[PDB]
């Protein structure tokens, strides 16, 4: 790996500089290098890894949606034929997106998840595994689409089972997991009633636990609760 000669601490320092400069491809390469040193990641380091790849794949997903929309219109009735270029370029961006998801899933499998024993780290990584299989499912159309969808579901479900046993209902990791699993049900699994039920139960159980929190923790939890409410308003 091209980061093999750089100190672990120097990689983490440069990931933070790259975030400040909005250089997210560099940030992701620095954090991949840090993971490949073989040591477990701290809470702060896990969040640097997630921020880096979320921004890279987020740009790819937005571009893919623009190109897919143009392609679908070109296949409508009455549209002038323009050749293979739209499909080719959508395929190019799709292949690059799939490569980024495969890179993240590979880091989780070698060997972040198997060394993660505490609930906060294990739930964080299983949620990430669900998220990157969900991004693969957004572009999947072939014989493997059902297995990709089940891999996302299975990862989210194991994370949910641990979070319900080991974390309070206001924990921000537990809340963000439930938010994203609810969107999986609505957008990917064609299960809008399951999506609405999960968001509502998660919101109500967090509301009843807010009284236990400090002012700073209350702010952290209510920010994610507002996203659950915004989705419920969109869906009902």
């Amino acid at each position: 790996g091209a980061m093999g000669s750089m100190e672990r601490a120097s990689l983490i320092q440069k990931a933070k500089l790259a975030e400040q400069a909005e250089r997210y491809e560099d940030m992701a390469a620095f954090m991949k290098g840090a993971v490949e040193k073989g040591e477990e990641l701290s809470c702060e380091e896990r969040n640097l890894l997630s921020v880096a790849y979320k921004n890279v794949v987020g740009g790819q997903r937005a571009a893919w949606r623009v190109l897919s929309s143009i392609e679908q219109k070109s296949n409508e009735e009455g549209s002038e034929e323009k050749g293979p270029e739209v499909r080719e370029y959508r395929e190019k961006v799709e292949t690059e997106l799939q490569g980024v998801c495969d890179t993240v899933l590979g880091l989780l499998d070698s060997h972040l998840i198997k060394e993660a024993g505490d609930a906060e780290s294990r739930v964080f990584y299983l949620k990430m595994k669900g998220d990157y299989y969900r991004y693969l499912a957004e572009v999947a159309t072939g014989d493997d689409k059902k297995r990709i969808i089940d891999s996302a579901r299975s990862a989210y479900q194991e994370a949910m089972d641990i979070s319900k046993k080991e974390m309070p209902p206001t924990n921000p990791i537990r809340l963000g997991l439930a938010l994203n699993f609810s969107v999986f049900h609505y957008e990917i699994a064609n299960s809008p009633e399951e999506a609405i039920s999960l968001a509502k139960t998660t919101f109500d159980e967090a509301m009843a636990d807010l009284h236990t929190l400090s002012e700073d923790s209350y702010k952290d939890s209510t920010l994610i609760m507002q996203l659950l409410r915004d989705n419920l308003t969109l869906w009902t």
Binding site: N47, S50, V51, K54, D131, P172, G176, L179, N180, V183, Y186, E187, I224, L227, D230, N231, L234, W235
Partner: peptide
């Protein structure tokens, strides 16, 4: 429109 998923920390 698209629903919200978990934002940056």
């Amino acid at each position: 429109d698209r629903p919200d998923t978990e934002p940056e920390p």
